[PDB]
């Protein structure tokens, strides 16, 4: 009782940090894989998706 | 491995350098078969004749002669900002 | 009167074990930043990491 909202997330227990994935934001986010060239710092972040 | 650094970066450097105030001549039209420089002289009835472009051979400045071997370091031994991992 | 445009090999060939042309992989590539071969190599080296 009182559960405000119930989502269907990717399983962090399965897609562990050992996978390099970071699910806390609600999307997978693997750093330093498909990083773009020739852009300002912080512009890499969308490619983490 | 380096072609992106040439086409997707250095090319802009050419594109902007081409608009510089002092690059006033038309250096090349993209067609080897037909291109020739426009050629001019200061000249007077009084008798002066001063070609702007002229062939005098090697000069003290060291601009006249070209070592084409410069291409090798450009390929086989030069880093670029694009390659590589991210650089501003 | 024309329009220059890119044409992916997947927009031409559609062979099952030659060219992956699943709409999933397609839209996944649609997400990707423009890539150089050094970037691709970096992606591989990351997955290996």
UniProtKB/Swiss-Prot annotation, chain A:
It is found in: Virion. Homodecamer; each decamer is made up of two conformers of VP2, called VP2A and VP2B. 12 homodecamers assemble to form an icosahedral capsid. Inner capsid protein that self-assembles to form an icosahedral capsid with a T=2 symmetry, which consists of 120 copies of VP2, with channels at each of its five-fold vertices. This capsid constitutes the innermost concentric layer of the viral mature particle. Belongs to the turreted BTV-fold inner capsid family. This is Inner capsid protein VP1. It comes from Bombyx mori cytoplasmic polyhedrosis virus (BmCPV). The lineage of its organism: Viruses, Riboviria, Orthornavirae, Duplornaviricota, Resentoviricetes. The chain holds residues 199 to 247 of 1333 of the full protein.
């Amino acid at each position: 009782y009182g559960a405000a909202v119930v989502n269907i997330d990717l399983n962090r227990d399965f897609f562990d940090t050992a996978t390099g994935i970071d699910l806390t934001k609600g999307i997978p986010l693997v750093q330093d894989l498909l990083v773009p060239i020739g852009v300002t710092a912080g512009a890499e972040q969308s490619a983490e998706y | 491995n380096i072609a992106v650094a040439h086409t997707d970066h250095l090319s802009v450097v050419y594109a902007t350098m081409s608009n510089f105030m002092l690059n006033f001549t038309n250096n090349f039209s993209g067609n080897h078969a037909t291109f020739k420089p426009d050629q001019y002289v200061i000249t007077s009835p009084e008798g002066s004749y001063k070609p702007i472009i002229e062939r005098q051979g090697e000069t003290v400045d060291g601009l006249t002669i070209i070592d084409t071997s410069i291409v090798w370091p450009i390929l086989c031994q030069c880093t670029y900002p694009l390659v590589r991992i991210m650089e501003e | 009167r024309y329009h220059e445009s890119v044409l992916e090999i997947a927009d031409i060939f559609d062979q099952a074990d030659f060219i992956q042309t699943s709409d999933a992989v397609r839209q996944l590539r649609a997400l990707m930043p423009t890539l150089s071969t050094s970037q691709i190599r970096h992606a591989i080296e990351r997955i290996a990491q």
